[PDB]
Ligand binder design. Structure first.
Ligand SMILES: CC(C)=CCSP(=O)(O)OP(=O)(O)O
Length: 301
């Protein structure tokens, strides 16, 4: 019953995470997993926890584990620092999450880990606010302010989250995709063409029109948008569009969850020639998907 039988919930989670990673061929480090769980295992037990796989072109599938909770302070930061998971790099990212919590009041936060690396991101979640609130933050890439007209044009006026990616040295702004233009396939063709990204098939465009949340990624090395991502949730295994991609099919059918009937969040990422791939998270305790609809003021499907 080392990894089986009667076990604490946190041990059930660890075993499930390693099983996913093995099944999808994702790399992982036992030392990094243990280090993450020493600090964060209790959080993973009691809050909105998810396991993600994603399939970047020409590399192995990555396996991430992440959680969020409705606390106004950035609790992950202290835990990660103490855990040896978050060292300064001599870079704008070092103070950015602190600046975000100073600049805009948070109603929740979360953290994201790649089990082959350690802590990748911390998220800041405010109540929905005008995007201009972000321009207060000292260490944001200069490219963010420079995209004021782009945000306005594409109805990216309602900021619903921020993140710092310590590994990638980038930041995402997340928008509530409330505008009726965002219910049309042309919107997605247009916003993707504005950046010279890849435009997906019609079948994928017809999925995107239901997206409640759009992320846009900025970095300090370039003036342009690195990639963007459209998030769509599915309330159970069967309603994931399993036919679109083999990773979607396999993960929907086989992802572990403690709750018998989990939903999923899928991120459709696009970039220039990387940046284009799919992310899928299983709602391991069943808390994430309802919270996702609620945070976007949408009835639960
Ligand atoms: C759960 C929400 C709605 C979005 C999470 S941000 P993300 O993990 O998709 O960000 P990246 O893939 O790191 O850009």
């Amino acid at each position: 019953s080392a990894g089986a039988g009667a076990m604490t919930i946190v041990n059930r989670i660890r075993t499930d995470v390693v099983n996913v990673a093995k099944s999808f061929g994702a790399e992982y480090s036992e030392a990094v997993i243990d280090q993450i769980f020493q600090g964060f295992g209790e959080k993973f037990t009691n809050t909105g926890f998810a396991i993600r796989v994603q399939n970047k072109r020409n590399q192995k599938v990555d396996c991430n584990i992440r959680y969020g909770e409705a606390k106004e302070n950035c609790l992950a930061w202290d835990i990660a620092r103490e855990s040896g998971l978050l060292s300064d790099q001599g870079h704008p990212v070092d103070t950015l999450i602190q600046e975000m919590f100073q600049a805009i009041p948070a109603i929740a936060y979360g953290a994201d880990f790649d089990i082959n690396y350690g802590l990748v991101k911390i998220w800041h979640l405010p109540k929905i606010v005008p995007v201009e609130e972000a321009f207060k933050i000292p260490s944001l890439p200069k490219s963010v302010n420079a995209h004021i007209d782009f945000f306005k044009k594409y109805h990216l006026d309602a900021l619903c989250a921020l993140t710092v990616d310590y590994r990638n040295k980038s930041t995402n702004l997340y928008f509530d995709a409330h505008h009726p233009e965002q219910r049309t396939t042309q919107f997605y063709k247009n916003i993707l063409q504005s950046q010279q990204f890849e435009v997906p098939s019609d079948e994928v465009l017809e999925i995107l029109v239901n997206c409640p949340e759009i992320a846009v990624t900025f970095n300090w090395s370039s003036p342009g948008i690195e990639r963007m991502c459209f998030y769509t949730a599915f309330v159970n295994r069967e309603t994931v569009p399993q036919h679109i991609n083999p990773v979607l099919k396999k993960f929907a059918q086989e992802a572990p969850a403690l709750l018998d009937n989990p939903g999923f969040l899928v991120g459709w990422s696009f970039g220039p020639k990387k940046g284009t791939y799919i992310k899928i998270d299983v709602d391991y305790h069943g808390l994430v998907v309802p919270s996702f609809f609620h945070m976007h003021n949408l009835p639960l499907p």
